[PDB]
Write an enzyme that holds these catalytic residues in place. Structure first.
Site: not given
Lengths: 153, 153, 153, 153
Positions: A10, A137-138, A102, A69, A71
């Site tokens: 943005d 597992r991930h 992960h 953006c 944040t």
């Protein structure tokens, strides 16, 4: 293998977007960088640019995305609304690394009003060069995210 | 008005979950805190607990949620797959504040292997006490996220 | 060359100190790790342990130090009061890297109530494996710090 | 009581220094802001500007200082070499708050290549409005730092 990167943002990142594109190119890990944020000094709405980058990935025009953006948070929310996309807000090396190891994320979400440019450099370089870990597992957790998305419809 | 908080986590936060619940209660900003993570020392899959908290909010059993994994990122992705939920990964005061002011997020996502406990205290207290800003531009962006979600179906 | 590491902390890190020592050993970059924080569950004063680690380095019993308090900040202040020591508060990969590349720091200062353990792992591994950059401008700045210290007397 | 603030930086902050001064003024917590970094677009050495700000405080021309480099770390090291000064590297709200509550720091050290501007705003506003806590244990630790400094000579 180097990746085809779609970069969206943005207006918060308008001043720095070319500096960010330069980082992506200098990382060595991109075969192409495509800018899909604003090309004018206007106020804009981050979900619209999140959607551009998501759709580039979904259509196979890019392999990976970066969304910027103020944040990162709005980008993360909006991108994750796309079916088939996992979008990770990262603010340091470890989040960048684990978002790939992960969560096998397609899109890196960062904040230019929260992370300084040298931290953004490290985040980008780490995200683009980290592969998803082979322990099952991930991946199984990622598959559960897919099941949720499908159920939501 | 104090809020009804649903707290979910995976096993990464099992050791600290009661400490986190204590923070929520001590914040003054919660009328009830409900724990919906694991009540045993077992490995579990964060999307399953994300879904618990999302569904609590959607059914009106809680007003707001906190989701805790190793980094927050998996929680953020999984929660955002729920229609009607906006989930924000926060790691400091400013992200906590803006996740509410701008993104009007329902769910705070945090990492217990990335954020220390005093930073988690500040994040929680800020998230629970910050309201969405009245300037129309942030709400309009939020409405665009809703349009994306609806279109995705 | 692997380094001889002196690790000091106050009571904030007492619960986690063995986990931290384990990280140092697992990094591959330490030939010895010496613990010089508290060996009891008592409240203590971080400057006293800062001094232990500083004096280990100055006497050549260790090459490098790690100091842990709630935030790192007290450790940073106290350690920097020693002539001949440069102590860097680091909270991510980039600060760890540049504290060595630019500031050629002897001591890493971290906060266990601010940085999570996986971030602490990355910080430690980066600090211990990063060398000071050969461009003369950073060394010249370091030399100016030495001049200040000498003038202060 | 509002404070007299000396702001110093190296060239890393030259582009943003007026934006930072504006934050200090807008905080409400400064009665005067004095800029003592570079007033030209030249490369400079951060210890020299650290010394300017330290000496302003020691002579009673300012009550508090802010020092800005690429990471804050060089500023922190150099400032702490001054007798009578405690300089705190801060990168978020909690470090800003505790650098005052616990460490009663005279100088805030920040990085403009590591912390984004909205995080810098929060850090500054928190540092300038937080007082040292009355529990005696933190003051006693501060007094130990003074003893170290005196012994070093």
């Amino acid at each position: 293998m180097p990746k085809r990167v779609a970069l969206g943002c943005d207006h918060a990142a308008y001043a720095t977007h070319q500096e960010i594109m330069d980082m992506v190119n200098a990382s060595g890990a991109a075969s192409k960088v495509m800018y899909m944020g604003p090309s004018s000094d206007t106020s804009v709405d981050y979900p619209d640019y999140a959607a551009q980058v998501c759709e580039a990935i979904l259509k196979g025009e890019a392999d990976t995305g970066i969304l910027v953006c103020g944040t990162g948070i709005g980008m993360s929310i909006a991108a994750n609304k796309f079916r088939g996309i996992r979008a990770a807000l990262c603010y340091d090396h470890v989040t960048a690394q684990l978002s790939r190891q992960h969560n096998n994320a397609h899109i890196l979400c960062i904040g230019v009003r929260t992370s300084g440019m040298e931290v953004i450099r490290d985040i980008i370089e780490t995200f683009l060069t980290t592969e998803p870990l082979a322990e099952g597992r991930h991946g199984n957790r990622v598959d559960k995210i897919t099941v949720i998305e499908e159920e939501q419809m």
